[PDB]
Amino acid sequence: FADEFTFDSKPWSSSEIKDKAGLEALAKKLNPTVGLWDPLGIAETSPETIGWFRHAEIKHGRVAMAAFVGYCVQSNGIHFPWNIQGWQGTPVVSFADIAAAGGPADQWDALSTPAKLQILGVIGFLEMWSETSVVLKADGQEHYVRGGKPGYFPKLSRSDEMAFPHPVPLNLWDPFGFTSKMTPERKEKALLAEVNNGRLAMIGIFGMISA
Amino acid sequence: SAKADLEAFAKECNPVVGYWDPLGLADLPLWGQDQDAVIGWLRHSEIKHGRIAMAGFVGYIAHANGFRFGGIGPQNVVPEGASAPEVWDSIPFLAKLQIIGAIGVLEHISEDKNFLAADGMKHYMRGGKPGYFPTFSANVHPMPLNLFDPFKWSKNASPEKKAKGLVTETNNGRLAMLGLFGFLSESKIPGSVPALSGIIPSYDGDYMQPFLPTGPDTSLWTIGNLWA
Amino acid sequence: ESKAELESLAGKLNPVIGYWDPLNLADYDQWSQGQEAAIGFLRHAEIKHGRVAMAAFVGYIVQSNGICWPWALTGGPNGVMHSDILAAGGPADQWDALPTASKLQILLFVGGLELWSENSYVLGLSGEKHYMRGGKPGFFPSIKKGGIPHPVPFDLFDPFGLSKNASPEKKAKGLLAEINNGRLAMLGIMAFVSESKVPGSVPALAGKIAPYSGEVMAPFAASDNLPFVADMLKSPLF
Numbered sequence: 118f119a120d121e122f123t124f125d126s127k128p129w130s131s132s133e134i135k136d137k138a139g140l141e142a143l144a145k146k147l148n149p150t151v152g153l154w155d156p157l158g159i160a161e162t163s164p165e166t167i168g169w170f171r172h173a174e175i176k177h178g179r180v181a182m183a184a185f186v187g188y189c190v191q192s193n194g195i196h197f198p199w200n201i202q203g204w205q206g207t208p209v210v211s212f213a214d215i216a217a218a219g220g221p222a223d224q225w226d227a228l229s230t231p232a233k234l235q236i237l238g239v240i241g242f243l244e245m246w247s248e249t250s251v252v253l254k255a256d257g258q259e260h261y262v263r264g265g266k267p268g269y270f271p272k273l274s275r276s277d278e279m280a281f282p283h284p285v286p287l288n289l290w291d292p293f294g295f296t297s298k299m300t301p302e303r304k305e306k307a308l309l310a311e312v313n314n315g316r317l318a319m320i321g322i323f324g325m326i327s328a
Numbered sequence: 329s330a331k332a333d334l335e336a337f338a339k340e341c342n343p344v345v346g347y348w349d350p351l352g353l354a355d356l357p358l359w360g361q362d363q364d365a366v367i368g369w370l371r372h373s374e375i376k377h378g379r380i381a382m383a384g385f386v387g388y389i390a391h392a393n394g395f396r397f398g399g400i401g402p403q404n405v406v407p408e409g410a411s412a413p414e415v416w417d418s419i420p421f422l423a424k425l426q427i428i429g430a431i432g433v434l435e436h437i438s439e440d441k442n443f444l445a446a447d448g449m450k451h452y453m454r455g456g457k458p459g460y461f462p463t464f465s466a467n468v469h470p471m472p473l474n475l476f477d478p479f480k481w482s483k484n485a486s487p488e489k490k491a492k493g494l495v496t497e498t499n500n501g502r503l504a505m506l507g508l509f510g511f512l513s514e515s516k517i518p519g520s521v522p523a524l525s526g527i528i529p530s531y532d533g534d535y536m537q538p539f540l541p542t543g544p545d546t547s548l549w550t551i552g553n554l555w556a
Numbered sequence: 557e558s559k560a561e562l563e564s565l566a567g568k569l570n571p572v573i574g575y576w577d578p579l580n581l582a583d584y585d586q587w588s589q590g591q592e593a594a595i596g597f598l599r600h601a602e603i604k605h606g607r608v609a610m611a612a613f614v615g616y617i618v619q620s621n622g623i624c625w626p627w628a629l630t631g632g633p634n635g636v637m638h639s640d641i642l643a644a645g646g647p648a649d650q651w652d653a654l655p656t657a658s659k660l661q662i663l664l665f666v667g668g669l670e671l672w673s674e675n676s677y678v679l680g681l682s683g684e685k686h687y688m689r690g691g692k693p694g695f696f697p698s699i700k701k702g703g704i705p706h707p708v709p710f711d712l713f714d715p716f717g718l719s720k721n722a723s724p725e726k727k728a729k730g731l732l733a734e735i736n737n738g739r740l741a742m743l744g745i746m747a748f749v750s751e752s753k754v755p756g757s758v759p760a761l762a763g764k765i766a767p768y769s770g771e772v773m774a775p776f777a778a779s780d781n782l783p784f785v786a787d788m789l790k791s792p793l794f
């Protein structure tokens with residue numbers, strides 16, 4: 118690992134976008150109308166920076182769409198029927214109480230501190246499992262900055278040497294094969310869709326937060 | 329020629345401006361030494377000033393905004409809400425002495441023949457790399473981590489990238505110098521840096537005097553404070 | 557350029573007059589760098605005055621007709637609105653009522669542009685050379701090609717590239733029109749300011765240009781507390 122912590126660049130060995138022409142191709146594929154809209158000129162950068170921007174956009178899309186759907190549900194008031202605390206001799210708090218706390222920001226605020234820490238801990242575990250190059254290379258890909266597909270979450274269920282000490286039941290993305298087998302380019306169609314509705318959900322969630 | 333290397337370095341730093349020596353200090357014979365040694369001195373001085381100014385800027389944001397370690401230490405005598413010029417003034421006299429002394433030991437190791445020769449290098453005025461701090465491979469007691477790149481993050485970095493990093497070091501150090509003395513100047517000649525108008529408070533006291541005010545004479549050691 | 561080429565330019569600008577230099581300022585050697593360098597500097601000065609004066613004419617018309625921007629100029633709980641700068645007075649009074657930082661930033665942005673134009677390394681990177689060294693007398697280089705660390709979105713001349721793919725004849729005709737429209741707009745803006753200071757100086761604009769008390773060739777007003785500004789403003793002049 119210390120040999121790979123370089124802080125520098127290594128040659129790319131994939132068909133991932135590493136130039137303005139490649140960015141433009143994906144731009145027209147996403148939307149033939151707008152094309153590449155890069156006023157800041159962050160297409161005029163290195164392959165690693167281009168991959169970084171691509172993955173950052175995809176991850177913002179994931180988090181923004183999840184946030185928008187969660188905001189809508191929590192505004193609708195479809196709370197959980199469980200109790201969120203009070204089994205190891207602690208005070209009792211209910212999801213109904215969290216809902217009655219207020220709007221979804223107020224609900225997160227009413228969420229207890231160790232609950233927040235545990236949620237953020239799970240999210241961080243997922244983030245670093247994503248960033249682990251060794252895991253992707255045991256799987257079939259590399260770090261997105263070093264020529265990997267931007268957005269790939271590695272499988273959390275496995276039997277390789279790079280498998281958790283206790284078996285994990287399912288994976289994060291596609292746990293039950295609802296993707297199953299899309300056609301070899303309908304996956305890419307769905308990626309284009311994902312980027313577009315990710316941008317739309319980004320605008321939507323920030324607009325709702327502003328409102 | 330050392331001058332040719334310096335002009336190329338200036339072009340790398342900024343090709344619009346290029347070599348900018350309005351005083352010919354690169355041609356000044358400091359101490360009667362030749363142009364190569366003098367340019368080594370000037371490059372070492374530029375890099376050292378820039379390095380210390382960058383650290384000073386980050387530490388100005390740290391101290392003035394409020395960023396302290398916890399526990400028994402010099403941090404417990406500085407008044408809360410004290411400004412960046414009062415933090416150094418408020419730490420103990422022994423803290424000031426030992427900070428400057430440790431910086432002195434690092435300077436001494438930087439210029440000592442022993443460490444630079446153990447690292448297979450020479451003094452920056454005697455055909456060496458200006459701005460190179462040697463590893464502590466000649467100190468008497470084996471020393472855990474070196475000053476530069478203590479975790480050895482740059483053990484395998486390209487020489488071209490290292491050259492570009494030094495080009496970055498010089499430029500960012502110059503800019504950090506300008507910013508840090510902007511902070512200092514706004515406190516002793518108000519309305520001199522227009523952006524900082526109202527941000528930096530005034531400071532009555534000589535910046536360039538290290539040991540004035542002398543600060544408290546407290547004894548912060550607890551277990552085994554026999555010297556008190 | 558040479559005197560023959562300058563005469564050809566004058567003939568193309570007005571075929572009745574042709575070369576019109578009653579002072580023979582083209583032959584006036586200044587900077588001690590030859591007639592080519594002198595004519596280059598004079599042509600650059602003419603073009604730059606024309607550009608700045610044309611822009612200033614449109615700015616004076618727009619600002620003097622109550623067309624301030626909707627958004628603010630200064631930010632904070634007590635910030636000077638563009639409407640407040642409008643209400644300060646006539647356009648020169650608007651400039652004088654600007655914040656000191658606003659004036660400084662405007663003039664230093666212009667200064668950065670001027671240094672950028674003057675640099676021969678940047679000009680060579682963009683192609684062409686200094687106007688006093690055989691380059692195009694008025695030609696702002698490419699802010700993109702110069703090598704600013706962050707890639708700028710658009711350049712200063714022709715940002716959207718609407719004059720791109722222009723016929724060379726159209727280009728020459730356009731540079732003739734630039735010089736002529738300049739030459740006229742210089743008189744236009746100076747007449748605006750002259751009516752502002754001395755009423756009745758330009759007889760046509762009677763009561764249509766607002767008055768102004770402070771000096772117009774004075775970027776900093778009394779409100780600007782910078783070194784020597786008040787001392788400079790202590791004594792006025794005709």
Ligand SMILES: CC(=O)O[C@H]1CC(C)(C)C(=C=C/C(C)=C/C=C/C(C)=C/C=C/C=C(C)/C=C/C=C(\C)C(=O)C[C@@]23O[C@]2(C)C[C@@H](O)CC3(C)C)[C@](C)(O)C1
Binds near residue numbers: 398399400401
């Ligand atoms: C001068 C003075 O008095 O100062 C005061 C003030 C000051 C300084 C502020 C103080 C303090 C606070 C301090 C110093 C606090 C320190 C806190 C600290 C040190 C907190 C670490 C947590 C680490 C975790 C949870 C790691 C989990 C790690 C895990 C899950 C693992 O072990 C995993 C693993 O390794 C295994 C088991 C082995 C392998 O098979 C596999 C790997 C490698 C994956 C003090 C004490 O008050 C003193």
Ligand code: KC2
Binds near residue numbers: 180269289304307
């Ligand atoms: C809550 C978060 C979240 C949301 C809201 C969301 C929504 C959508 C939508 C919207 C309707 C579409 C249409 C869509 C489509 C695809 N998603 Mg996606 N997705 C989320 C999370 C993840 C994760 C973690 C991964 C992932 C992926 C893929 C692949 C690639 C398959 C492959 O080629 O293997 C495709 C086609 C994987 C990947 O590699 O992405 C580059 C991957 O690891 N997604 N995703």
Ligand code: KC2
Binds near residue numbers: 383493496
């Ligand atoms: C507070 C102090 C400080 C700051 C703020 C700072 C910032 C930056 C920045 C950020 C703008 C860059 C980009 C940069 C780059 C490089 N630094 Mg530097 N640096 C500081 C301290 C030291 C010390 C002590 C040494 C050192 C070095 C190098 C080398 C050479 C590598 C090699 O050639 O092996 C490179 C490339 C070593 C050396 O040999 O320099 C000739 C060395 O000993 N630095 N440094």
Ligand code: KC2
Binds near residue numbers: 401424426548549
């Ligand atoms: C980077 C700089 C640095 C270095 C490298 C360094 C090295 C050594 C070594 C070498 C092996 C020894 C043996 C040693 C010993 C002591 N150091 Mg010291 N020290 C540094 C910095 C500070 C600061 C800031 C303070 C401090 C102090 C004390 C006290 C007295 C405590 C007391 O009297 O309460 C004792 C016994 C404190 C002090 O004097 O507080 C009034 C205090 O604040 N040191 N220190």
Ligand code: KC2
Binds near residue numbers: 611692712726
């Ligand atoms: C206040 C600013 C300003 C104004 C209001 C203005 C007005 C006019 C008018 C109307 C009055 C015409 C008809 C005209 C025409 C042309 N202008 Mg022009 N111009 C301004 C600024 C600049 C700058 C900075 C440059 C420039 C240029 C050209 C070229 C290119 C020719 C070529 O490509 O050879 C042509 C044809 C560029 C150049 O190269 O000029 C030699 C160049 O750098 N202009 N320009």
Ligand SMILES: CC1=C(C#C/C(C)=C/C=C/C(C)=C/C=C/C=C(C)/C=C/C=C(C)/C=C/[C@@]23O[C@]2(C)C[C@@H](O)CC3(C)C)C(C)(C)C[C@H](O)C1
Binds near residue numbers: 287288
């Ligand atoms: C207090 C006390 C006691 C106690 C106690 C004990 C033992 C307490 C135990 C608490 C315990 C055991 C708490 C677990 C929480 C787990 C969570 C929240 C998991 C979320 C997991 C999630 C959200 C998983 C999601 C996924 O996995 C899914 C569904 C499929 C995969 O494809 C994908 C991923 C990975 C995303 C005694 C013994 C009674 C007496 C003693 O004296 C004192």
Ligand SMILES: CC1=C(C#C/C(C)=C/C=C/C(C)=C/C=C/C=C(C)/C=C/C=C(C)/C=C/[C@@]23O[C@]2(C)C[C@@H](O)CC3(C)C)C(C)(C)C[C@H](O)C1
Binds near residue numbers: 473
């Ligand atoms: C990690 C690192 C670096 C660093 C660092 C830093 C900031 C280091 C700072 C270290 C510091 C500040 C170290 C203080 C030690 C104090 C000691 C030993 C005190 C002893 C005290 C003793 C022995 C006292 C004993 C007594 O009172 C006792 C107990 C009772 C009696 O019996 C006897 C007496 C009375 C005598 C580098 C190298 C600079 C760069 C590298 O890149 C990374």
